[PDB]
Amino acid sequence: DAFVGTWKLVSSENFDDYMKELGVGFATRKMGGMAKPNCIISVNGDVITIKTESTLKNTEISFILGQEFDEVTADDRKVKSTITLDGGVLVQVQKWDGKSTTIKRKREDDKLVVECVMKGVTCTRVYERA
């Protein structure tokens, strides 16, 4: 849809603070912060696939909107994820150990804008088409 494509990170705001709030350690935050991932989004019927690729870590999820799934995150959290489409926004919640974080993926002009919230910390990651 609006989301399908190959996208490259072009800017990041507050990612270090977000990783800290998630409980990511210093060494991993150091490696993660200077990464410039690509994100490849595809759809085949009910099933959406999001691949996030980088030099030091690749992840992939495939899901059906509204259907909870188990996910191991890039930082090795074992979470329950649910992704829904709300007003053109892909809204992902990840739940684990009584905590949650929300990851919203939105299309804005030429950008794929990713807003990540954990407690008081909001991180914005901006991607453009490769």
Ligand X SMILES: O=C(O)c1ccccc1NC(=O)N1CCc2ccccc21
User: By the criterion CB under 6 A, which residues form the site for ligand X?
Assistant: 32, 35, 37, 52, 54, 57, 59, 74, 103, 114, 116, 125
Question: Of the two residues 30 and 46, which places its CB atom closer to ligand X in the complex?
Answer: 30
Query: Element (H or E) spanning 9, and its range?
Result: strand 5-13
CB of 15 to ligand X, least distance (A): 8
125 labelled ligand-binding: yes
Tokens representing residue 126 in the block: 């901006």
| 126 labelled ligand-binding | yes
What is the closest distance, in whole angstroms, from the C-beta atom of residue 129 to ligand X in the complex?
Answer: 15
Three-class secondary structure of residue 46 per DSSP: coil
Within 13 Å of residue 43, how many CA atoms lie on the same side as its CB?
9
DSSP state of 10: E
> Nearest distance from residue 59's CB to ligand X, in Å?
4
Is 107 annotated among the ligand-binding residues?
A: no
65: nearest Cα among 105, 37, 101: 105
Output the known binding site for a fatty acid. Answer: 125-127
